[PDB]
Write a protein that binds this ligand. Structure first.
Ligand SMILES: CC[C@@H](O)C[C@@H](O)c1c(CC(=O)OC)cc2c(c1O)C(=O)c1c(O)cccc1C2=O
Ligand SMILES: CC[C@@H](O)C[C@@H](O)c1c(CC(=O)OC)cc2c(c1O)C(=O)c1c(O)cccc1C2=O
Ligand SMILES: CC[C@H](O)C[C@@H](O)c1c(CC(=O)OC)cc2c(c1O)C(=O)c1c(O)cccc1C2=O
Ligand SMILES: CC[C@H](O)C[C@@H](O)c1c(CC(=O)OC)cc2c(c1O)C(=O)c1c(O)cccc1C2=O
Lengths: 141, 140, 143, 141
């Protein structure tokens, strides 16, 4: 039973439930996610919490992250997930399209001190954009 | 457009699984080359078997969502997204019970005001990944 | 060194070179690919040879199949390949677009009696279609 | 003739040739690309030139960006492109694999004062990652 994978599964559940009160349990104080850089300078558990909140706000409370597979190698975990949502909040300067979508994701996670220290994820941006009807942005984010 | 209306009825038939009225919009000589592996049937009967297979393989809850539909003369292009769960044998791959969703592009040719030729391109590789990349147990 | 994997690499090399003199070495007499049922009733090394020729005709002599990875499990091989080409011949009723494209592919091959007996391949149809400029078919026929 | 589309085509040409001496002609002094934030805090023509350099360093001098289609709506341009390269440089902590790859991209560009002022680019991250043999990162750094 991998502690690393169990922690990643808690992370996934956070996206599903939206509940982030306990994230300090598995999110390192120095947690970073380069994908968040455009939105905030926060780090650690508060950074992960703001990501989860953004997901529920933008892609609906009913947004789901489904697990396809999770593997590990030393202090690293690779998660193959699928995001299901509906576009209901402003997304980087694109007005809500109200469109359903689903997009595969690959996540790379690095563990330090038994907690998630670095988190990179690659949404299916283009696939999502297509399913959103390829909206034209209304403003720069 | 009556053509776009017909394609929307086709999409609904996948969603409801109800194929009693398909002769309304499916040409007697309807062909879908993607079906050749499974059957030699044509027309409304062929379309119905395709719909039945989707419900059997991808669950009763399988549905097609519309992204967009375009037309040009006697042709329609439908940009759709299939949502389902792999519950039935899929060309020799055993049921995985896994959820999946994959964009699709459908090209439809109308003759005599009905759908005469139908090509569709599922996201085979994306679906395969979401199904955990199963190894086939047999040749279809 | 897997003989099955070696056979699949010979298959890939045939698409690359267009050289098919020796395909009977590794293609089963009863070889079938369900994806080409629309085009011909051929089977065996004969079917494979014409499929290779069609690729070179439709996607140019310079069309390439690059290997990402190949794995095997008992009598089955899974090949992760990438096709590169330029669309220069009629393709299912769509006129040549002259467009460069590249698309990942997943191939599933079943061996029987030491030769490739069943071959299923999944091109990135939609990705390819996008890169071709999403052409409208001119005919539902071959033309 | 669209001056905007012409400008975006000069941008595309810069990725292809690696020739960036004239980028100030079409890149706004305040040009930003949020995709670059992990790597640099630069803005303007300098940021664009750095991006081009990184592409050539990481994906080889032979890297090419092919045009599928470009459209515009008011002060916005959408470019549908395809990147071709070979993974020859360290890529966010993943060692060079020497592997060929090609992946579609969608770019969204906003013009201000007749120059490219904001640039968002969605590579096919997952498809590229696959073609690179899904490498495990050697560092987070
Ligand atoms: C706080 C800032 C963020 O939370 C936004 C950022 O998280 C974000 C995410 C979160 C994520 O990585 O997957 C759950 C996803 C997307 C995005 C995102 O900013 C996107 O911006 C995005 C897009 O512009 C076009 C298509 C798809 C997407 C996304 O899928
Ligand atoms: C200054 C540094 C940057 O320029 C890096 C950034 O360019 C970057 C680019 C540039 C790009 O937009 O293509 C024309 C592409 C990728 C990436 C990138 O940082 C990637 O990081 C990347 C990846 O991690 C996995 C798969 C693909 C990619 C990229 O395709
Ligand atoms: C009647 C039986 C059929 O025609 C099977 C066939 O419908 C079929 C469909 C339905 C369709 O859209 O083609 C018209 C979809 C898939 C498939 C299919 O046979 C697949 O076989 C399939 C697969 O093997 C791996 C991933 C995805 C798929 C499919 O999405
Ligand atoms: C004899 C005629 C043929 O066999 C056509 C057939 O070869 C074919 C191949 C080759 C192959 O993968 O078969 C084993 C590839 C494609 C296709 C094909 O017929 C396609 O039709 C096709 C398409 O309509 C839209 C996008 C992509 C493709 C293909 O990539």
């Amino acid at each position: 039973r991998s502690e690393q994978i169990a922690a990643v599964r808690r992370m996934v559940e956070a996206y599903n439930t939206g509940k982030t009160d306990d994230v300090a349990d598995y999110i390192h104080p120095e947690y970073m996610n380069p994908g968040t850089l455009e939105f905030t300078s926060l780090r650690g558990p508060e950074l992960f919490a703001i990501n989860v909140a953004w997901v529920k706000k933008t892609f609906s409370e009913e947004a789901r992250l489904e697990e396809v597979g999770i593997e590990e190698r030393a202090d690293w975990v690779r998660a193959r997930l699928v995001l299901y949502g509906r576009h209901v909040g402003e997304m980087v300067g694109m007005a809500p399209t109200g469109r359903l979508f689903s997009g595969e994701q690959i996540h790379l996670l690095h563990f330090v001190d038994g907690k998630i220290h670095h988190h990179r994820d690659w949404p299916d941006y283009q696939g999502t954009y297509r399913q959103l009807g390829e909206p034209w942005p209304e403003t720069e984010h």
